[PDB]
Homo-oligomer: 383 residues x 2
């Protein structure tokens, strides 16, 4: 990124080092990129990338027989550099992903197969997800939205560094209704104590998904406050994570929530599907059910939707009838100031202070007129 | 009902008796109707009819003060024949139905009050229903539709005489998924045994709603098969009840299901409302979710909707494109014969063999043309 084309004569790069790390710095300047691996490499005859690859072609209906499988193996990048394929096919058979009809040896997708493909889910993750859902449908808590959120809470990657001492403090202060959900999932208070007392991550044993469970329940709490319209600064102080890690999490959970919804629909689990089908939109914007209609407008996010709701505008229909200058004023009240704000400067009438995507700078007035204009266009398309 | 006006010269009535019951028969011929009671009569200072009456006028907003209450007491039929009112007002206060603001002594409705009124529910029944729902939301089974049905299964009157021996036979053969729902509700196997072994109805103690629970769970099983499109004859043989008692039950449960849905909506219980809001339509016709669209047509019931679904017509949209004579044929296949049916009689082309409400006799042809005609009119109103 050193050197602007058409602007600079040269691009300069400086790597600051010490005498001790002097040799490692030179290694980088002379270093070159490593050769590209296939990521489908084989004491592991089976592998995730291959299992998914084989599942996609069989369920999709472009690979039926055993001859089609090895023909596919020829097209891979792994074979370009110049058994394992057969192992993945059996794996799909053992775990009810694929069917075999002896037309000798022809493979067809199951309901679980077609569901996994439509859900864009990884076959390795689908097994635990399928069990987790069946476990939840045997005993489910409906008095709050926490248990539902847990099912759509992603835990395939760490989104933040969790302070366990902070976690235990929230555990005790946690209401009884949410402790019931914790117990029902696997959250044991004993494991939480062995985390604060001693910084033993363990996780060496495969059976230590016990760690992931507590990380997942911690995350669901964050997502619970998030769709409860709890301020980002409160969530930051309460949990110990920045706004960057949160936004990356909600956009991840919004997508994941859609996956579990599709997965539940293709298996015929209507009751479970019915509950989940409202959280994709709520996780995206971080809102409650009431603001779901307002946030259809492009410029209206969580903060702008709430202040317009609390001012009499509950729906797009109510927002189309709106007086523009009234919308503008309500927007002006949602701004965050360090001092308890909420002189006359008439030189700020042209200040473009509202950002969009692929944006021209919008004034607070122009944005308001756009919100009312868009609301009317949507109101007509609703008929 | 003896004597047709404009037809008969006299109407004759004969009461057949023996010598032993001779005196009781004469008592009827000379007998006259008893005076009409008020049904709001008072060791019972409080009474159901009064509590409901007082609740309706306060929540509705036509009675606020204490003066309005006794003014209402004057308009009653009980006072027409010429304390207790004050007792009912306190009862509504004790059970969170009504609020009191000391403008000395002014009464307003609570959320629980406004919910009960909108639900058309009796205040006496609302207390147990409110507890039952809160109990269900703490631990709910979603793998089947049984637990949801239990919440909308009415038990304020007996709809049939339950054979307990038959019940215990269905209990053992009952799958594990439905035994979990039974335990979760209150169905104890010990009580079922003390019913078959000994015909002890008990029910003298008020705390013996334990009887109602088992009667309610028995009923939910019937409703489960009913919306699973299990034949009426199978349900008759399996449970021991006639088709008359069943139809009276489903139309009762369809109405009740709507009540619990409204009740849940006014309390803000969205998750619970979401699950219940699909069973009013299914209980009415006795169908599965797939036939919900077809049964919008007036002439299409459960039986006609299924045979049209299994023949390629899944929606009203598919049914508007239908060839009339094809619909007619599919209908002809749904008819029940004692022999394994499903000569050429062309004299039955005018036989009106299909009944409607406020009906002219419809031929199987005319009905088919009406179904396709109605489907098209509905398809246009859907846009
Ligand atoms: K938006
Ligand atoms: K109908």
């Amino acid at each position: 990124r050193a050197g602007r084309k058409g602007v600079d004569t040269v691009g300069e790069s400086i790597l600051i080092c010490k005498n001790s790390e002097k040799s490692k710095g030179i290694a980088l300047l002379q270093g070159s990129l490593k050769p590209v691996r296939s990521c489908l490499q084989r004491g592991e005859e089976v592998t995730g990338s291959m299992i998914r690859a084989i599942l996609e072609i069989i369920v999709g209906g472009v690979a039926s027989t055993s001859q089609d499988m090895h023909t596919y193996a020829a097209c891979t990048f792994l074979a370009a550099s110049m058994g394992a394929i057969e192992a993945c096919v059996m794996w799909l058979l053992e775990n009810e992903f694929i069917q075999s009809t002896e037309e000798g040896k022809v493979y067809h997708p199951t309901h679980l197969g077609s569901a996994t493909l439509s859900s864009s889910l990884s076959p390795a993750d689908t097994l635990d997800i399928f069990a987790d859902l069946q476990r939840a449908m045997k005993g489910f808590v409906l008095e709050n939205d926490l248990h539902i959120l847990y099912l759509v809470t992603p835990m395939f990657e760490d989104w933040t560094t969790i302070d366990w001492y902070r976690f235990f403090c929230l555990w005790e202060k946690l209401p009884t209704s949410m402790k019931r959900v914790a117990e029902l999932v696997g959250v044991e208070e004993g494991f939480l104590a062995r985390c604060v007392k001693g910084k033993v991550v363990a996780r060496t044993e495969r059976q230590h998904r016990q760690m992931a469970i507590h990380k997942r329940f911690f995350t669901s709490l964050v997502l619970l406050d998030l769709i409860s319209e709890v301020p980002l600064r409160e969530i930051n102080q309460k949990y110990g994570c920045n706004r960057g890690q949160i936004q990356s999490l909600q956009q991840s959970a919004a997508v994941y929530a859609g996956m579990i919804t599709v997965f539940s629909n293709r298996l015929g689990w209507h009751n479970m599907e019915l509950l989940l089908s409202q959280f994709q939109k709520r996780l995206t914007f971080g809102i409650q059910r009431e603001l779901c209609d307002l946030v259809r407008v492009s410029l209206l996010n969580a903060q702008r939707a709430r202040v317009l709701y609390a001012s009499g505008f509950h729906t797009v229909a109510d927002l189309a009838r709106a007086n523009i200058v009234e919308v503008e004023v309500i927007l002006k009240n949602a701004v965050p100031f360090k001092s308890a704000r909420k002189e006359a400067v008439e030189e700020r009438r042209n200040m473009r202070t509202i950002w969009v995507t692929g944006r021209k700078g919008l004034t607070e007035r122009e944005a308001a007129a756009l919100i009312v204009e868009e609301a009317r266009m949507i109101l007509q398309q609703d008929l």
